[PDB]
Amino acid sequence: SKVTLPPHYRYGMSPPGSVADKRKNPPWIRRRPVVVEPISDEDWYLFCGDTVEILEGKDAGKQGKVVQVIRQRNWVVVGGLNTHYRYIGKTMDYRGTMIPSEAPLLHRQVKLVDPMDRKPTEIEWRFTEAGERVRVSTRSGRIIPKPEFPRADGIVPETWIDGPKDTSVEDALERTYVPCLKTLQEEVMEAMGIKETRKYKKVYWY
Amino acid sequence: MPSPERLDKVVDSMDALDKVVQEREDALRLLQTGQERARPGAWRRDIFGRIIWHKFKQWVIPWHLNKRYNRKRFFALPYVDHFLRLEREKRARIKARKENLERKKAKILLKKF
Amino acid sequence: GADRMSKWTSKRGPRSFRGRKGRGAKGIGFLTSGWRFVQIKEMVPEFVVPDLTGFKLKPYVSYLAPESEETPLTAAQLFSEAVAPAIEKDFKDGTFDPDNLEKYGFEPTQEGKLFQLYPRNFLR
Amino acid sequence: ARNVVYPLYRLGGPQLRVFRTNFFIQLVRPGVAQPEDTVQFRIPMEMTRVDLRNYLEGIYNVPVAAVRTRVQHGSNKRRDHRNVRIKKPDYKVAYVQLAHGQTFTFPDLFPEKDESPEGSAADDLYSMLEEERQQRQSSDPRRGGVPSWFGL
Amino acid sequence: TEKEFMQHARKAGLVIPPEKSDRSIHLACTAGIFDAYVPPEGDARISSLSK
Amino acid sequence: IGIRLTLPPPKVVDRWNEKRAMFGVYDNIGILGNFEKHPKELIRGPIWLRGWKGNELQRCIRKRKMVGSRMFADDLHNLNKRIRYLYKHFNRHGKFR
Amino acid sequence: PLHKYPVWLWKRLQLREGICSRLPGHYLRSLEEERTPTPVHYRPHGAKFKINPKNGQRERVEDVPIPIYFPPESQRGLWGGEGWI
RNA sequence: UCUCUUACUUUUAACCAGUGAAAUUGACCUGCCCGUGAAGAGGCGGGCAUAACACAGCAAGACGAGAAGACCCUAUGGAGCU
RNA sequence: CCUCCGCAUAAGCCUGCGUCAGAUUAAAACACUGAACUGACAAUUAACAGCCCAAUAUCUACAAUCAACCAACAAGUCAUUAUUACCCUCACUGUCAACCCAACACAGGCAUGCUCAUAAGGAAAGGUUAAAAAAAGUAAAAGGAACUCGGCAAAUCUUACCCC
RNA sequence: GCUAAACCUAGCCCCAAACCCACUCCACCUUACUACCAGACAACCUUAGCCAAACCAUUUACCCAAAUAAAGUAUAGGCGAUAGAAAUUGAAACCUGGCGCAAUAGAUAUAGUACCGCAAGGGAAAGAUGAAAAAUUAUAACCAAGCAUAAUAUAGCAAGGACUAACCCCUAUACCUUCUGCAUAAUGAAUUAACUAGAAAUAACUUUGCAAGGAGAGCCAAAGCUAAGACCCCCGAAACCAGACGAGCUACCUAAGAACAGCUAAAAGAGCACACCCGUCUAUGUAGCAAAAUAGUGGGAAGAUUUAUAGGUAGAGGCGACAAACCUA
Ligand SMILES: [Mg+2]
Ligand SMILES: [Mg+2]
Ligand SMILES: [Mg+2]
Ligand SMILES: [Mg+2]
Ligand SMILES: [Mg+2]
Ligand SMILES: [Mg+2]
Ligand SMILES: [Mg+2]
Ligand SMILES: [Mg+2]
Ligand SMILES: [Mg+2]
Ligand SMILES: [Mg+2]
Ligand SMILES: [Mg+2]
Ligand SMILES: [Mg+2]
Ligand SMILES: [Mg+2]
Ligand SMILES: [Mg+2]
Ligand SMILES: [Mg+2]
Ligand SMILES: [Mg+2]
Ligand SMILES: [Mg+2]
Ligand SMILES: [Mg+2]
Ligand SMILES: [Mg+2]
Ligand SMILES: [Mg+2]
Ligand SMILES: [Mg+2]
Ligand SMILES: [Mg+2]
Ligand SMILES: [Mg+2]
Ligand SMILES: [Mg+2]
Ligand SMILES: [Mg+2]
Ligand SMILES: [Mg+2]
Ligand SMILES: [Mg+2]
Ligand SMILES: [Mg+2]
Ligand SMILES: [Mg+2]
Ligand SMILES: [Mg+2]
Ligand SMILES: [Mg+2]
């Protein structure tokens, strides 16, 4: 869950704690770092879910949808577009099920596309005076909304039913706090009826 | 394990509760005595010349007739000034190497792009 | 050579070194003349548990609960929510005295009570 | 509680009361045969016998009769790849005995899975895998090496 | 005089992407066929125009 | 074997740099800027050798004099030993005496 | 690399840094006084220039002191301005 | 012990199967007699000998291998002692 | 078939032949699978032994050796009272192993109690042949030191003299 | 064709500028990582020496106030090796760099970690694919010593002249160093890859520039002055001094302990003889089981004995039933 990675550790289209990730780069390994474009956390525009357009590769010009961003190498993987082929089920006597897998593209090789006329377009982070922060097209001047993508919790809010050990909403927000100058200790000691009558004597701290 | 995220959820929920209770005690202590650090202590300089935050230890008799506390030495005794200077220079060398490597890495990035 | 790097635990020395070390448990008494241990009941910690019978609050929260901004409690906020209406009200009636602050919850010195705050009498 | 400085007991002082305790224990299945009332736990190092008695008699209302604890030595023999030793941690196991003639047997938590929901994100791929494996394994020793794809 | 070999590897792919992720594999086909076209038994016998 | 199998990447150098194009500008400043500055005041280097050629013994002596009050301890001891060794070398050993 | 300040100025820098800065200023002057003692264990020169034998040319003359060592018994009682040589 | 050695057993030893060192090594396709030679030759001169190659022994030679002779001499080199 | 070993305590080390899986590889001086191993899992539970004592004064000449005669010199290994204070009780630590010090799975070193040959504990021979040389043994015709610096070694038991 | 070979990039070096850091909770001077009790002891001290004087005995730059000049001048000095000022002059505020290294290089460093020693302390080695390894594909092959594909053919510093043919035929005393002289049977070297050894002055020569003047203050000058080029190695001792670390082996001592079967016991620093301590002689072993053992044979074994634990005496010394013996092989 909370594991520190080596200082020059490659990021490799698997999650960092996975099994084949521990297969690929074990803690023994030391290889050349991939020098990458440093990009601020305010200028990065494309998120995980919006439609994009590939500019160069084996299939330039086609549009598609990104499925993951790997920010440690400025990577995106568009859905089923920049693909190659690999066999999944493999044994010593049989291997088939040839399934296409995507290949990661840099952010320079990928342009965002506006839903009005559906062309690749350059973007500006034109901050709105009405409070919020949203992307704005340059050439046509249309607002590009951040798309709704299912969150990383693995859960959806609307069809969520409370279990036995899930507290209700109305009891999660009931304000019982009456602010007073007591500690928690003496408060629950007088709530529980516990009575202590003998004194704490002088003690020498040094 | 069936669902391992449940243990993480209970752990950081209890840490949120401990943080709330400690915040209430700390605000009440600032209003009543105006001191942070409910374990009282004092900046002292130990035998190796370092400056530390010594925490007090809640004894029964006062300090001047404590036999164990009077063997612990809180002073510098000037043969350690040379070793203090050497440690200072070692820290300066490490910081200089880090800053120069940052210079070089930024030059590599402006080289490639 | 002996093993320098592995830490010095209670299992390592001679027969006198074993027993004098311990593993970190806070003692609850004292040894008297005939090697007897006398437990003192006021030193062994008494767990103060409540009755959880009609309690309606679970170890998890429902995801339907809304979010809000975090605000850590500050001593000015505790002053404003605790003492400021009382001092404000009895100052409007002109009966407020700066001399006696003890009637609003202020304590001049912690030496009297049981749960004294700055030397931290209480355990946890 | 652990990692918390205890208030020193001057004689005739108040009762040391811990309110939000800090100890977390693990009921654990034994590795050897034990009698019917012995219930083996796994407790932190800073816990005593009397603390385990009051812990089980305050929170779970378990009537406890006798408690015996011991320290287990975690192994320190595994080397890393740079030959520095990796330390399995020490821990403290404790065996409580129930009081009033009660018995205890450790349950079986894992047997037995009976589940067959709809599968899309994992079992549709398993259905693809299994149907490809059921179809394509029709090799013939009488063809002798020829590919069985051409209708000719 | 204290050195060993390297390269513990395995030669069979497996099902890591459901072990946890939020990207599923984008297929472009299916496994088999929906319902098999059973041809007529005399298709070479009726290999002319019609009957 | 010592030789490399593949020839190295092409080393491309910009001859019309910023630094290469203005190299030697404000050199020759004293002659035709009526001698307000020396061309040795254009040198940017260590504070002891700015306009001074010197030996190896002379460079070490000048560095100890001009800077050795504020050097690090190990560097100062290494400079002391270097001056001791170079005195012993230049004034006792060699040919041509 | 090099230190910014020389090694012999770190004492005055420590005087200007922390609680030593909050000492009263006349104490700081009396501490940073650094004046010379009267001669005890040597005879000082009379003049500033002393014509010498073997060439009748005047030379500058200074008088340098003796590095005399004072044990702690000199701190316990009033000695002169004298100690061990 | 010897005149004067002999027989048997075990270890060792030879072959088979497994694992598997160390000193040494300028390169060698590495013979004998006489003579010569930095004065004691497998490599030089005159004669003689001469298909290639395994395995077990012996120690006449390789001025044999380990230790920049420990004996002799020198150093305007050391040290102990009187 | 051997046992001159073994079981414990102390000292030392710190999980170092318990289970499952890998044994495709890796150390087994070879292999099975396990002392020259990888990962995971589980154990050593105190009554045994450590960890102790409220003060101020005061007291303490007649050894031990079955302690009983006798007999000694090196003259010895063990003790309380008066007054005040004192009424709570079983907390903590060690407990595993085929193990320590010698670079090693080393014919070396290692304190005490117990049975002085065992109720414990183990295997000198990988298989074949019966060469030379070498080592350890057994036996030998007649002679018995004739060998050698010297009766060295071995075998039997062995007298007398001298120097220091 | 196996072992193999190849990689760039982690980082580092020298400068400039700038004065730099340190409690999340608990534990950490007693046996540090230990929650908890009555003698309170406490720091202030000229460095020495190797080395040069071709020995060595006074002597021998190292000292912490910016440069240049006066100047290597006055001075000091077995007046000798060498040491060496001062009066005085003046010292243009700001710029983020490399005719530096690239895994035997550069910090020792992936690290003061592994490993060695009781302790102070010593102290390493190494990694290389690709845009994608959620592409394990078929390539990419070619190159040191060493081997295999593929053992040998009479004769001889291994080769040369050749020749129709590899050999056969004629000629030929390996290299470096030290030497009057080496094939010498005088030293060094198994081989391959990488690393590993000429640093500078006064005075002279040449080439420019100026010229009785030269030089960007100071210094020289009866053709001189200024600038440049060109030129003086590496490894190796026994030793000396200063400060720390060592009595867990061993020499002795102190504290409180433990062991010594059986027989004859004359009474006993008595006799035979176990356990135990030591090691007279022989044999094996000599990179051995062992950096001092094994087997036999031996001396002591109720004492000046042996031994378990802790402490003490440390190098200009400790200790010593004097072996100039021992003080971590
Ligand atoms: Mg001859
Ligand atoms: Mg020869
Ligand atoms: Mg020889
Ligand atoms: Mg010699
Ligand atoms: Mg001479
Ligand atoms: Mg001499
Ligand atoms: Mg000498
Ligand atoms: Mg001496
Ligand atoms: Mg046991
Ligand atoms: Mg048996
Ligand atoms: Mg055999
Ligand atoms: Mg006979
Ligand atoms: Mg004879
Ligand atoms: Mg004879
Ligand atoms: Mg004999
Ligand atoms: Mg000399
Ligand atoms: Mg000389
Ligand atoms: Mg390196
Ligand atoms: Mg080759
Ligand atoms: Mg010939
Ligand atoms: Mg010749
Ligand atoms: Mg020579
Ligand atoms: Mg000669
Ligand atoms: Mg030779
Ligand atoms: Mg010679
Ligand atoms: Mg040789
Ligand atoms: Mg001793
Ligand atoms: Mg006797
Ligand atoms: Mg005897
Ligand atoms: Mg003696
Ligand atoms: Mg003598």
Curated annotation (Swiss-Prot), chain A:
Keyword Mitochondrion among UniProt keywords: yes
Q: Does the keyword Isomerase apply?
A: no
Q: Which residues form the KOW domain?
A: 46-79
Residues annotated as carrying Phosphoserine in the record are: S14
Question: Which superkingdom?
Answer: Eukaryota
**What UniProt keywords are attached to this protein's entry?**
Mitochondrion, Phosphoprotein, Ribonucleoprotein, Ribosomal protein, Transit peptide
- Kindly give the PROSITE patterns that the UniProt entry links to this protein: RIBOSOMAL_L24 (PS01108)
Entries under InterPro entries matching the protein:
KOW, Rib_uL2_dom2, Ribosomal_uL24, Ribosomal_uL24_CS, Ribosomal_uL24_KOW, Translation_prot_SH3-like_sf
Citing just one GO molecular function, the answer is: structural constituent of ribosome
User: Which residues, by range, are in coiled-coil regions?
Assistant: none
Assembly: Component of the mitochondrial large ribosomal subunit (mt-LSU). Mature mammalian 55S mitochondrial ribosomes consist of a small (28S) and a large (39S) subunit. The 28S small subunit contains a 12S ribosomal RNA (12S mt-rRNA) and 30 different proteins. The 39S large subunit contains a 16S rRNA (16S mt-rRNA), a copy of mitochondrial valine transfer RNA (mt-tRNA(Val)), which plays an integral structural role, and 52 different proteins.
In the record, the note on similarity to other proteins reads: Belongs to the universal ribosomal protein uL24 family.
Protein known as: Large ribosomal subunit protein uL24m
Q: What is the lineage of its organism?
A: Eukaryota, Metazoa, Chordata, Craniata, Vertebrata
Instruction: From the UniProt record, report the name of the gene that encodes this protein.
Output: MRPL24
From Swiss-Prot, chain D:
Where's it mainly located? mitochondrion
Q: Where is the composition biased (Basic and acidic residues)?
A: 130-143
Q: Where in the cell is it found?
A: Mitochondrion
Task: Note down the stretches annotated as region Disordered.
Answer: 107-152
Name the source's superkingdom.
Eukaryota
Q: Record's InterPro entries?
A: Nucleotide-bd_a/b_plait_sf, Ribosomal_uL23-like, Ribosomal_uL23/eL15/eS24_sf
This entry's Gene Ontology molecular function terms read:
RNA binding; structural constituent of ribosome
| Example GO biological process | translation
Q: Which residues form a coiled coil?
A: none
Would you name any one GO CC term?
mitochondrial large ribosomal subunit
Q: Which UniProt keywords apply?
A: Mitochondrion, Ribonucleoprotein, Ribosomal protein
Describe the family membership recorded for this protein in Swiss-Prot or TrEMBL: Belongs to the universal ribosomal protein uL23 family.
Describe its assembly. Answer: Component of the mitochondrial large ribosomal subunit (mt-LSU). Mature mammalian 55S mitochondrial ribosomes consist of a small (28S) and a large (39S) subunit. The 28S small subunit contains a 12S ribosomal RNA (12S mt-rRNA) and 30 different proteins. The 39S large subunit contains a 16S rRNA (16S mt-rRNA), a copy of mitochondrial valine transfer RNA (mt-tRNA(Val)), which plays an integral structural role, and 52 different proteins.
Official protein name in the record: Large ribosomal subunit protein uL23m
Swiss-Prot record, chain E:
Compartmental location: Mitochondrion
Q: Which family does it belong to?
A: Belongs to the mitochondrion-specific ribosomal protein mL45 family.
Q: What does this protein do?
A: Component of the mitochondrial large ribosomal subunit (mt-LSU). Within the mitochondrial ribosomes, required to direct the nascent polypeptide toward the tunnel exit and position the exit at a distance from the membrane surface.
According to the record's subunit comment, the protein's assembly and interactions are:
Component of the mitochondrial large ribosomal subunit (mt-LSU). Mature mammalian 55S mitochondrial ribosomes consist of a small (28S) and a large (39S) subunit. The 28S small subunit contains a 12S ribosomal RNA (12S mt-rRNA) and 30 different proteins. The 39S large subunit contains a 16S rRNA (16S mt-rRNA), a copy of mitochondrial valine transfer RNA (mt-tRNA(Val)), which plays an integral structural role, and 52 different proteins.
**Protein name as it appears in the record:** Large ribosomal subunit protein mL45
Gene that encodes the chain: MRPL45
Q: Which residues of the full protein are shown?
A: 52 to 102 of 306
Curated annotation (Swiss-Prot), chain F:
- Please classify the protein's predominant subcellular localization into one broad category: mitochondrion
**Presence of keyword Transcription regulation:** no
Task: Cite a single GO MF annotation.
Answer: structural constituent of ribosome
Any Gene Ontology biological process: translation
Instruction: List, alphabetically, the GO terms of the cellular component aspect.
Output: mitochondrial inner membrane; mitochondrial large ribosomal subunit; mitochondrial ribosome; mitochondrion
Q: Family per UniProt?
A: Belongs to the mitochondrion-specific ribosomal protein mL51 family.
The UniProt subunit note reads as follows: Component of the mitochondrial large ribosomal subunit (mt-LSU). Mature mammalian 55S mitochondrial ribosomes consist of a small (28S) and a large (39S) subunit. The 28S small subunit contains a 12S ribosomal RNA (12S mt-rRNA) and 30 different proteins. The 39S large subunit contains a 16S rRNA (16S mt-rRNA), a copy of mitochondrial valine transfer RNA (mt-tRNA(Val)), which plays an integral structural role, and 52 different proteins. Interacts with OXA1L.
User: What is the name of the protein in this document?
Assistant: Large ribosomal subunit protein mL51
Q: Which organism is it from?
A: Homo sapiens (Human)
